[PDB]
Design a protein around this ligand. Structure first.
Ligand SMILES: O=C(O)[C@H]1O[C@H]1C(=O)O
Lengths: 56, 228, 304, 334
């Protein structure tokens, strides 16, 4: 098929021109984000009672 | 133990909602749900018209015969992967599987060297021994009789099955086909298959469906009571 | 004359037969009923009327069986070593559970009916509330029925003697006979007739539906089970109720003891006593473990 | 010519693979080697919503952390109140085959869909079918409100669509998948979104256009769930492969795989925990598993259901997690 192969080639060519950052520069960012919001996660560090909505 | 006006109003609303939900559930628990299946165009069009009194996906039909309200779900317009939505039909009472007898010496238009009877057998095998359906009964409708009967002569059944060794009479060719379809059941100890050579232009299909459904219901009730 | 041997036979039949049979029944019934109850508790949900009735029957069987261990120490030591209050409580609970089991069986038979007629549970008596209401009514009615047994069950205490007399061998034989006949009529004959009637109707339905269907598996197993239930109930219960009244009437005013005959009758009553208790052991199997559904589910939940 | 294009496509694929391989100097398992473990995560069932009469297929929270909407295959869509066990709304559907739910960010509307190939939008006024969008040719499998007048739907005909609720017209169509699309997730800024399909692949689409910017592969089977990392730089994938996989947009490759030898069931949903340090995945074995997203270590297990876990959701504040199931039970854990 000369109609679908052209679209596939165009799509493949359009995705190979993207700039990529080195790995270990994106894992560091994930680690930093996880570290900077540690105290705002009630599931990681549970909040004391009288602050939990479903204490009951 | 103190409650405000707003809290009491909310509780009253929740109780009314729950009451309506229970009423709806009890009302909908008295309906028989059947799943209509078929390969290609074996039927599902004359069957539905014969049984109805009251690509868009599921198509739903109501009808009552003596005291039972049947809902039939035709899902032949779903040209999607059958593996990702079949489990929605796990609790249906029975599966009505339609197979056309005349499609024993024809091939699919989109692909040759492929009998339609073999495709129907493949689909029946896949659905009968499929999970989610280890305790669901099947009503097999062998449609398009009197055209296979008059087409059997001058066109031997060996075109479909090259092993058949017998006369060309309709009375035994039909029995051979029915047995070949019934032999695909690998759960003979937990499932039943009701077969009907449904070329009855009268109201004989609805009667057969009613009888099979009542038998299924009685067997289920006896099973739940310890008897079977 | 010709009944000294009868006396020895009666003594041995009281001392050994009753103890061994009661022990065997205790162990087997306790095992089965405990299995059934724990299967119903932490393994089954969506309770319906039939489940309520069956659970009540199992509870009654277990309660009846709990009264046996204190009766097996006796018949071996030759006397009742516990307090009079304990004796009265033991016999009262034994009889109350014995006569509650019958009503629960009758209502199970009635519930088997009303499901061939109303397969969608669309009847008033099939509501889960009516089941519990009727269970409470049954318990209270049986307790009220057994209330007038207290005067007779009163124990015997005298010089160098502390013995508990069974129901048939206590109190005034006239009032005792009248009460025994009333208890028989109210607690055995009427429930038996109701059960027989409803099971006969169910069997007729099964026979009519079996021979007028398409080519399908016949309804032969349920008919056999329906017949077996009635057969077992009648066989296990009738001789005991006949012999109890015969013995009670044997020691009335017009005895005449023409051939010291009041030894054979007591022996027959003793032999028939432990047969009736066999229903408590049998019921678990017949009503729960004979069905593939319940045993399969219980095993699956036992595997955790 | 056919070969002139096939060879070019193969060359482009090889070049892309080599370019993305020559970028993995390290891995997200050596950097986090010294990171201390999160420990043992233990949660208790705080609430049990008990209204549905059949299997539950979808669930959503809404930007309030109080009310949530649940859909079951009994023709009912129930809006609850988490802090209590009250029912605020119960909507009867025209079709009882529903596989999706959505709560508007403003709380005014809700949406549903299923085997009828139609997306129905109900107006809560905070009850009445406000709109019915019908342009797909396959069962809907997901839907997410972008605004009060925009919605993104995904269908089993291997396509996604961006609609216009006011007029009902299909504003844009996203194509490229070669299989049913089973999930989609909106980026926090609602400028891009990812979709996972049954061809064992995921794609990143720009909402303002109709072009796929990146394609991520590596799963060995269908993908049933998708989730975005809280900062919108990465995403999570749930599949039957029993291999939870984290991928990055900027690096354009896979980072970590979450799997165990004793797990053989497929994953039916995934979700994060407001910080990206925990990944909660629902399984077919009635269990939910909490993984340490930075170390790929199973932190904990939630087991309170008995038929399956078809829907999992975390409160916006990560205060609690609602878990609906085919057992018609919505369990809220904290
Ligand atoms: O026969 C027994 O010893 C027990 O049934 C109790 C009684 O009749 O006293």
């Amino acid at each position: 098929s000369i109609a679908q192969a052209r679209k596939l080639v165009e799509q493949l060519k359009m995705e190979a021109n993207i700039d990529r950052i080195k790995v270990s520069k994106a894992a560091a960012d994930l680690m930093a984000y996880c570290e900077a919001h540690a105290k705002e996660d009630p599931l990681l560090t549970p909040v004391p009672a009288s602050e939990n909505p479903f204490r009951e | 133990c103190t409650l405000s006006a707003e809290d009491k109003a909310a509780v009253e609303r929740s109780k009314m909602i729950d009451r309506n939900l229970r009423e709806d559930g009890e009302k909908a628990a008295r309906e028989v749900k059947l799943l209509l299946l078929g390969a290609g165009e074996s039927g599902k069009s004359t069957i539905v018209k014969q049984m109805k009194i009251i690509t868009t996906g599921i198509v739903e039909t109501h009808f009552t015969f003596k005291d039972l309200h049947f809902k039939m779900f035709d899902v032949g317009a779903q040209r999607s992967e059958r593996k990702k939505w079949i489990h929605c039909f796990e609790g249906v009472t029975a599966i009505i599987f339609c197979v056309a007898l005349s499609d024993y010496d024809l091939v699919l238009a989109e692909d040759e060297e492929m009998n339609r009877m073999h495709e129907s057998m493949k689909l029946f095998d896949s659905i009968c021994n499929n999970k989610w359906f280890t305790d669901t009964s099947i009503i097999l409708f062998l449609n398009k009789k009197d055209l296979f009967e008059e087409k059997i002569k001058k066109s031997p059944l060996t075109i479909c099955y090259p092993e058949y060794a017998g006369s060309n009479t309709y009375e035994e060719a039909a029995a051979y086909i029915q047995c070949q379809f019934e032999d695909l059941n690998k759960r003979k100890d937990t499932k039943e298959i009701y077969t009907h050579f449904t070329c009855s232009t009268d109201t004989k299909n609805v009667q057969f469906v009613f009888d099979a459904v009542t038998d299924v219901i009685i067997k289920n009730n006896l099973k739940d009571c310890g008897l079977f | 004359a010709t009944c000294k041997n009868w006396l020895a036979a009666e003594a041995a039949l009281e001392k050994y037969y009753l103890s061994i049979f009661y022990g065997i029944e205790f162990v087997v019934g306790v095992l089965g009923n405990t299995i059934v109850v724990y299967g119903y508790i932490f393994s089954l949900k969506n309770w319906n009327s039939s489940n309520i009735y069956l659970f009540n029957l199992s509870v009654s069987d277990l309660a009846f069986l709990c009264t046996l261990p204190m009766l097996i120490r006796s018949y071996a030591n030759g006397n009742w070593i516990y307090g009079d209050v304990l004796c009265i409580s033991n016999r009262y609970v034994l009889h109350a559970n014995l006569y509650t089991s019958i009503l629960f069986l009758t209502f199970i038979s009635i519930d088997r009916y009303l499901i061939i007629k109303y397969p969608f549970r669309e009847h008033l008596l099939q509501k889960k509330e009516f089941a519990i209401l009727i269970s409470l009514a049954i318990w209270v009615l049986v307790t009220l029925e057994l209330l007038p047994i207290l005067p007779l069950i009163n124990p015997v205490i005298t010089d160098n003697g502390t013995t508990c007399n069974d129901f048939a061998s206590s109190g005034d034989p006239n009032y005792n006979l009248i009460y025994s006949m009333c208890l028989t009529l109210l607690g055995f004959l009427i429930p038996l007739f109701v059960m027989c009637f409803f099971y006969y109707k169910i069997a007729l339905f099964l026979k009519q539906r079996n021979r007028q269907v398409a080519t399908a598996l016949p309804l032969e197993k349920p008919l056999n089970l329906v017949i077996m239930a009635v057969v077992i109930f009648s066989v296990l219960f009738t001789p005991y109720h006949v012999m109890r009244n015969v013995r009670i009437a044997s020691r009335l005013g017009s005895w005449k003891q023409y051939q010291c005959t009041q030894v054979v009758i007591n022996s027959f009553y003793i032999v028939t006593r432990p047969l009736a208790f066999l229903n408590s052991v049998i019921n678990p199997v017949f009503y729960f473990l004979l069905g593939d559904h319940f045993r399969d589910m219980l095993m699956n939940q036992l595997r955790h | 010519e056919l070969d002139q294009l096939r060879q070019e496509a193969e060359q482009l694929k090889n070049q892309i693979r080599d370019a993305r391989k020559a970028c993995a100097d390290a891995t997200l398992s050596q950097i986090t080697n010294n990171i201390d473990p999160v420990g043992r995560i233990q949660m208790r069932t705080r609430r049990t919503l008990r209204g549905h009469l059949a299997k539950i297929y979808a669930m959503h929270w809404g930007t309030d952390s109080r009310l949530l909407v649940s859909a079951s295959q009994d023709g009912k869509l129930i809006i609850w109140d988490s802090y209590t066990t009250n029912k605020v709304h119960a909507i009867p559907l025209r079709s009882s085959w529903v596989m999706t739910c959505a709560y508007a960010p403003s709380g005014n509307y809700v949406a549903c869909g299923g085997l009828d190939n139609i997306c129905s939008i109900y107006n809560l006024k905070t009850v009445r079918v406000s709109r019915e969008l019908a342009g797909h040719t396959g069962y809907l499998s997901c839907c997410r409100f972008l605004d009060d007048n925009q919605i993104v739907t995904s269908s089993g005909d291997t396509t996604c669509a961006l609609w216009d609720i006011e007029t009902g017209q299909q504003t844009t169509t996203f194509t490229g998948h070669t299989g049913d699309v089973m999930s989609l997730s909106l980026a926090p800024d609602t400028r891009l979104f990812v979709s996972g399909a049954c061809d064992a692949s995921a794609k990143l689409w720009d909402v303002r256009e109709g072009m796929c910017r990146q394609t991520f592969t590596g799963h060995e089977s269908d993908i049933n769930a998708i989730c975005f990392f809280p900062n919108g730089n990465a995403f999570a994938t749930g599949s039957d492969d029993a291999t939870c996989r984290l991928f990055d947009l900027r690096a354009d490759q896979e980072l970590m795989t979450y799997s165990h030898d004793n797990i053989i069931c497929g994953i039916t949903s995934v979700s994060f925990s407001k910080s990206g340090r925990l990944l909660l995945a629902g399984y077919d074995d009635f269990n939910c598993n909490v993984w340490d997203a930075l170390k790929a270590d199973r932190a904990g297990v939630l087991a309170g259901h008995d038929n399956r876990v078809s829907c999992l959701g975390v409160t916006d504040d990560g205060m609690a997690v609602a878990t609906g199931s085919w057992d018609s039970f919505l369990k809220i854990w904290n």
